[PDB]
Amino acid sequence: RRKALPPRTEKMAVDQDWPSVYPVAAPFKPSAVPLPVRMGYPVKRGVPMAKEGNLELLKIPNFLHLTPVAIKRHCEALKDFCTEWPAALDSDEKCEKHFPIEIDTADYVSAGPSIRNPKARVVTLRVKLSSLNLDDHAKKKLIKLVGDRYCKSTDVLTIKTDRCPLKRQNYDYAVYLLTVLYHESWKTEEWEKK
Amino acid sequence: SLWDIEFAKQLAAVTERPFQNGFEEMIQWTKEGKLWEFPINNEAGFDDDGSEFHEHIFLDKYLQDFPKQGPIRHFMELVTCGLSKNPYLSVKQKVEHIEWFRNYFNEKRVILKESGIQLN
Amino acid sequence: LSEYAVRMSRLSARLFGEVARPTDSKSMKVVKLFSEQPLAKRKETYDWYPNHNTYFALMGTLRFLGLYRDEHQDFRDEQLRLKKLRGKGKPRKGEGKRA
């Protein structure tokens, strides 16, 4: 006893909401797609294969759950979780005058059982030396204390920390490095007289 | 109390249902722990015993049981720098390495006295 | 090279956490040995080959329980059955050379 059931194509309404049929990622089951699509290299006398049992239609990723209708329907409900951006910080000139420190943090994604990526531990700290309160000798000492990490043409100091395992630990180490450099740039020891 | 678990399973019997949507299929797996936490951060589930940077970088606190003015400090500063520049190991493993060196040098006392440099 | 410069470098090393006192390049091998992960401890090294014993045991248990159907093992068993029916089987342990 073999039973043959007709697919959803004969029952699909022309005004039916498509995200209701394809809300999330699907393997592109031809039983729920009323669109006759032909994929594959045709024959000298033939045509591209039909959608039924087409391996090439399952090989390729489907964006049927990401049609513009579904994109709008999803983005409309996402207005509640987001916040408003301050319009007083549109130009970077005032952004540098208010928040001079830039914190570059890397984050990676990958499909699989593992999430740990050793490239994620690096934390970059970029500080513009023209927005601080260093004096002349303090700046001249900070230059020779940081070495090549300070770009003289761009007037920016870059501290790239990777010694701590955790990203938050590297962030704390970077802010400690900035603090200890700003503190040591002022101490005039005995060897600075020579 | 086993009766509390008996009530909890009877609550779950009417709470759970076969999945009617892929959204629910992801919600249940995210609440249980199968799905990842979005946005995907590469440090989810690893706290490193709640340690900070002062437990990793600053390791001079463990070299007090060594001669300061001898070559032992000159040898151990390199080990301290290497352990501070090692994001792969935890704090306890570095403490165990320091203790291994401590007990090795404290067990081998005749060789340091024979070498000509006084070590304790 | 000046005294002010060498003092500045000695302070920069102490602040950044590097080796402050001057050391020869040969003594930095023990620095690198702890600064980097050893070869035998890397995951790509110590987890090179998966558990082929687990693979084979799981497949055989499923085959004997009636879920997996190994065509290659069935072919081996059929060939061994035909060989033993023809008359050339595997001798018993201990009677091959003497007996």
Binding site: - | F53, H54, I57, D60 | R21
Partner: peptide, 18 residues
């Protein structure tokens, strides 16, 4: 030769690095 004294614990307690 000559070695300069560096305040390690002092800097740690000042910058919360102890």
């Amino acid at each position: 030769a000559a070695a300069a004294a560096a305040a390690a614990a002092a800097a740690a307690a000042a910058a919360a690095a102890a």
